[PDB]
Structures are given as structure tokens and as C-alpha cells.
Design a protein around this ligand. Structure first.
Ligand SMILES: Cc1ncc(COP(=O)(O)O)c(C=O)c1O
Lengths: 143, 143
């Protein structure tokens, strides 16, 4: 079905344009690295608490991510309500463990997990989980 | 004062992600072709007259466009208040004339202007002009 075409676009990439909503209601656009989980139809991204986009999501969790197909013109957009973990506070907390799982999914096995753990805490990292509630766009064959 | 490095990114591309505001407050995203006037500092795109949730653009013209650089992660986002022409309604009205100029600036001389004119009318095409008010993003470096 049509949605399968859109999900295939999301599954075939690891970068997308995240749209969050500013205090004044205007959209803010950022490019982000992500991992798509086909099991639960989720898009997971690592963000830092001090960033404007993160502050936007804290006030209004509604988010959208546009992903390009392999032709660089056709695309799919995932719409949903973001679920954020609290920022990493201690090297061994649940947020850090969740970020370790993400790193493995996106980059592979880190060389020094202790260094990674420390960095997540230092940068107040947060795991953004975006369950896809709706998808739209113009997938290959439609452009 | 905008970052010349970011303006250069916009000048070196012809497509980007357009973001407008839907009735429920969520952004509507799409991949579009654009023309950038580096002196007047404005970006122009052609869109079909918005309908349904997207029609809100008619009462809240705030818009942004993200443009990808040619390196790993760099990008520029142009933000402004869009100005829209009425939708094309006649093959020779002022709107179609404006869209012909846009096509020339973006792609050049068209092979069959008569085909182009009817296409604009059939798609109720609107020329969206975005005077750049703010530019943000991650500028690329030496490469
Ligand atoms: C608000 C904001 N802060 C920071 C960044 C840089 O990314 P990171 O925090 O993962 O280093 C971005 C990238 O798009 C951003 O939009």
C-alpha cells in the first residue's frame, strides 16, 4: 500500500529534516541523524538538552521529519508526537543506556563505552523517540 | 546581517525543504525547487494553491526553507513572511506571466510555453515570494 512506499523511503536513509515548533508557533528546521525501527515504526534520534530544537520539543512535543529517497527529490514525511527521555545525568542511568543502544544501531560498537557514557552526561544528551502516527509525501514513481 | 557562508549554500543549490504552517499548528513539509535572488535577498517557489490543512498559509504566511550544502552536515535555513500571488486562473494572467519568469530564472527557456501556461492554470499555481528575514544553520568550511 502507499504507506509502505513512504516507509521504505524512511527505512532507506539515516538523515532527515526535523521540524519542531518554536515558542511563537513558527517551524524550526534542523537536519538530524536517525535510526528507523521497523518493529515499532519509530524514528530515534540523539539530541542535546540545551539546543533550541530540544527546548521546542519540551514545550510542544509535536514533530515531523522529512526524508529524501535515493533519487534526492522524492520524499516521505513522518508525523508524530515525540517522546523524550530526561537528559543523561549519570554515566550509568537509563538515558545513557538508551543512547548506547542507539549508537549501536547507528554507528556500531563504540571503542570506549566509558568515554561515550561520560560524553552523554557532559552534553546532557536526550533520546528522542518519534512513533510514526502518520506519513505523507511523494515517494519514487510519483515525482 | 546574514552569514555569507549560509547565503552561499542557498546560492549553490536549487532545491530545499519548504515548511508552512497548517491549521493545527504543525508544519507542512515538502521538497521544492526555488530561485534565489542574491541581491534582493529573496527566495521564490511555485506551489499549487493550498487546500485543506495547508490552506492556513493564506492567513499565516510565515515560512522557512532548508537548503543542504555539499559536505557532510552543513545547511542553511531562510526564514521569512511569504507573499503569494493569486492562483493562476488564465493562461495569460499576471500570475502565469510571473511564473514564466520564475521558470526562466530556475530552468531557463522552456520548449513549449503554451504547455507551461495551461499546466500552471490546471495546477492553480501560485508564485510564493519569500523575503529573507532570518538565516540560520550550520555553515560549511574549507573543502
Ligand atoms: C538547535 C541545534 N543545536 C545543535 C545542532 C548540532 O547537532 P548536535 O547537537 O547533534 O551536535 C543542530 C543541528 O541541526 C541544531 O539544529
Amino acid at each position: 500500500v502507499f504507506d509502505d512506499k513512504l516507509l521504505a523511503v524512511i527505512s532507506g536513509n539515516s538523515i532527515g529534516v526535523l521540524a519542531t515548533i518554536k515558542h511563537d508557533g513558527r517551524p524550526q528546521l534542523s537536519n538530524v541523524q536517525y535510526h528507523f525501527d521497523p518493529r515499532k515504526l519509530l524514528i530515534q534520534v540523539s539530541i542535546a538538552e540545551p539546543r533550541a530544537k530540544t527546548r521546542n520539543l519540551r514545550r510542544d512535543p509535536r514533530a515531523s521529519i522529512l526524508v529524501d529517497a535515493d533519487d534526492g527529490w522524492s520524499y516521505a514525511v513522518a508525523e508524530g508526537t515525540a517522546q523524550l527521555t530526561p537528559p543523561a545525568a549519570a554515566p550509568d542511568d537509563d538515558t545513557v543506556e538508551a543512547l548506547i543502544a542507539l549508537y549501536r544501531n547507528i554507528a556500531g560498537e563504540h571503542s570506549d563505552w566509558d568515554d561515550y557514557r561520560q560524553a552523554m552526561v557532559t552534553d546532557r544528551r536526550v533520546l528522542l523517540t518519534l512513533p510514526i502516527s502518520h506519513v505523507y509525501g511523494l515517494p519514487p514513481g510519483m515525482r
